[PDB]
């Protein structure tokens, strides 16, 4: 087995700047046939890896000219000439000189943009939900940057802990923002217990916390 190690597992990057990712193999990758079979791939959420570079430095058809690759022996590097919005994602090196084929652990590129405060929305449970077992209240934080954000649930003016879960998108390819959902899940009877449901949002882009609320009914 040839171990492939990448660095740096995360990279913050200013648009228009160049970026470099390294990959080290535990074994020289020169093949009997004279080629060195080290490839670079880019993966976006929910999609297969897409090959950018093959044989250390050959560009795949239709790959933007700002991607390039270099290296030899056990040391290789991917380069972006001028990063654009669409370059966010996870980048993998892989080798095909030896079976088993092996891959690095991946390096995630994040592109720093102008701070953007979240648009906050609260969704009362559809009437449908009450006559199930549980009831889900959703608070949405849309199109913000950076990723760090805080969401507090208040039920009739009192903080509520232990019944909320968060989920966050990856950095968007087009506007480079994040979005986040916080879902408060209560029992049928509990959701009846209270009147007012609020989510309070804190973020570097918000001069004061933003609260969205609704009255049950």
């Amino acid at each position: 087995y040839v171990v492939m190690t990448q660095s740096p597992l995360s990279l913050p990057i200013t648009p228009g700047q160049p970026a470099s990712i390294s990959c080290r193999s535990s074994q020289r990758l020169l093949h009997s046939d004279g080629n060195t079979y080290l490839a670079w791939y880019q993966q976006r959420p929910g999609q297969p890896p897409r090959r950018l570079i093959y044989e250390v430095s050959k560009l795949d058809s239709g790959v933007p000219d700002r991607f390039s690759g270099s290296g030899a022996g056990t040391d290789f590097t991917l380069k972006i000439s001028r990063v654009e919005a669409e370059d966010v994602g996870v980048y993998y090196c892989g080798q095909n000189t030896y079976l088993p084929y092996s891959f690095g652990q991946g390096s995630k590129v994040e592109i720093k943009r102008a701070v953007a405060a979240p648009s906050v929305f609260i969704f009362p449970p559809s009437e449908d939900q009450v006559k199930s077992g549980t009831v889900s209240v959703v608070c949405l934080l849309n199109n913000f940057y950076p990723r760090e954000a805080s969401v507090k649930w208040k039920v009739d003016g009192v903080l509520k802990t232990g019944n909320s879960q968060e989920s966050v998108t990856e950095q968007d390819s087009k506007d480079n923002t994040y979005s986040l959902s916080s879902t408060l899940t209560l029992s049928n009877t509990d959701y009846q217990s209270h009147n007012v449901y609020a989510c309070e949002v804190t973020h570097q882009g918000l001069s004061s916390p933003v609260t969205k609320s609704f009255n049950r009914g």
Binding site: N96, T97, F121
Partner: protein, 225 residues
Amino acid sequence: EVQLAESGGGLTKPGGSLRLSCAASGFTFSDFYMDWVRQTPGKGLEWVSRINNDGRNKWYADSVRGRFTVSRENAKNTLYLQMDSLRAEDTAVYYCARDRPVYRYWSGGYHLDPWGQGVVVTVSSASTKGPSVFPLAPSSRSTSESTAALGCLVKDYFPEPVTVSWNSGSLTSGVHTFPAVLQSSGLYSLSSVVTVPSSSLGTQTYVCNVNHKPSNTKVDKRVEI
């Protein structure tokens, strides 16, 4: 035009069997070696198997040898992965990928390009369960906030994945579908949201289309105020 179309994912119990398919078009399939590669959030990308162009020679990763077998039907342009004695640990997204080309008098380099779209294989004793879909609706309030958000809560399904589109894939701008969260119940939930102008609610209809291939279910939910 060079495409690899995968099928055959889904849920099986430990010890069971599953058969993946990879249909190729846009190239002479019998000219290329092919591979299977899998991916988990934990171990990353792991190569599974390779087969040469005529299907005579096959290779396997140590972790699957003796349990998985790779084959191909060149007359049907189809690659197969037969997964027997499935283990909890085989749960992953499985991809096929095109590899070495073979010419008349020699063979080319080694490749994984292009890749198929991926299918989810889940190995679990838990049973399939389809999703409950609920509208995420605004209220008649934010008149002067120009944009409104709406969505669909896709709740209590198993296993992954569900896919969510809006208005049959015509509405894609501003759509965010969140990663599913595993609940304490062992079932999954996610939301899909989208932002539209407030000058639209009552002007046009928004329907989320939820596909859950494992349970055989497609749900359409029009979201209203």
